[PDB]
Amino acid sequence: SGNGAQGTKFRISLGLPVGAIMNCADNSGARNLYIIAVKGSGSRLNRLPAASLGDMVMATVKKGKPELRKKVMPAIVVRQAKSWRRRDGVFLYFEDNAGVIANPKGEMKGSAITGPVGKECADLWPRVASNSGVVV
Amino acid sequence: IIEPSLKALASKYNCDKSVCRKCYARLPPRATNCRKRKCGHTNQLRPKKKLK
């Protein structure tokens, strides 16, 4: 999990499992990301791994810039639709699951993030915060 | 900084020993007969490696 993570997170409701196809905010030409795996993600029979906000995933592009697709690449999810709980009590959610392409060291490939971003990702991945314009 | 007057002492308890070829157990350098029973009190010993 700590492959570029500055800090360490609380548990967030695991929204989108593998097979999920979430948008891509970064300005790297992509349009969607097919999650194939998750860092962390222990094992249980017949359980398929899941990704929460702030988690790293390993991903596969389906639409955008054939230079990119047909290969795996790390990614960082920054919006999810599953209502999750903050320690201040409130349950929040976004309107779409969306992510970012990234390198294993937690850095990014793109120069911006088209949309809002979760504090539970941005505190943790710092190179995302410098490229985000909005946080929640 | 170990001042080899004292390096000799540390080596008495660390690196002046003899080891079984059959159980890999620290034994004294003068002794035969590995004291452990699972080896069968054998006599196949060697010195411990100190140079290269």
Partner: protein, 224 residues
Amino acid sequence: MATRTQFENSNEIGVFSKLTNTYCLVAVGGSENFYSAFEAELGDAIPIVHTTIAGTRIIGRMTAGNRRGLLVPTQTTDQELQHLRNSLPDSVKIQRVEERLSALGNVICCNDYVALVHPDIDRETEELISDVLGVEVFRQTISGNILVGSYCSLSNQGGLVHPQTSVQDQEELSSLLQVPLVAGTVNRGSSVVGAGMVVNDYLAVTGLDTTAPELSVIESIFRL
């Protein structure tokens, strides 16, 4: 002087800290040597305040301050605001902004006497900014990267940009600001230059990985 440190293990100091000619800001993650890049470089010249706005440690890219004012987003709470009002002078005018963006330090590149703002900022913040900081604005671009305060550090005496910056745009911003600048990367070839460091008149701060050929251009362009 470029006093290099890492926050915890991250070389991105303009994320976690902020520094100007009257104060400095830092987050809550320990690593006392990191504080010893200012507590060792400053006497009692100015204060260093430890804060976590909104539960966030990322002070620099959420906040946006100057010599006579600090801009602070909407989500921040009165209790992270109260210590920030007390342990600073009464000179700086604090003000919770009530606009749509939040990462103010990724849209603003402010020094004491000029600024640069993200294009689609609120036109009410367009004037709040000059009423609280007393500074002008020019909300155009850097090289196409709308996020200006992350891809440009600033002092009054110098400037810095990423290496993709067109030499036409470099001289453009020079003609804007009456400050020099260079297409200088940081932290061993990073493009997030606004976050890889925080600069003042006499003090620069980068990451431990930041290398001497980068310090060379930094001390040149910023000190004078």
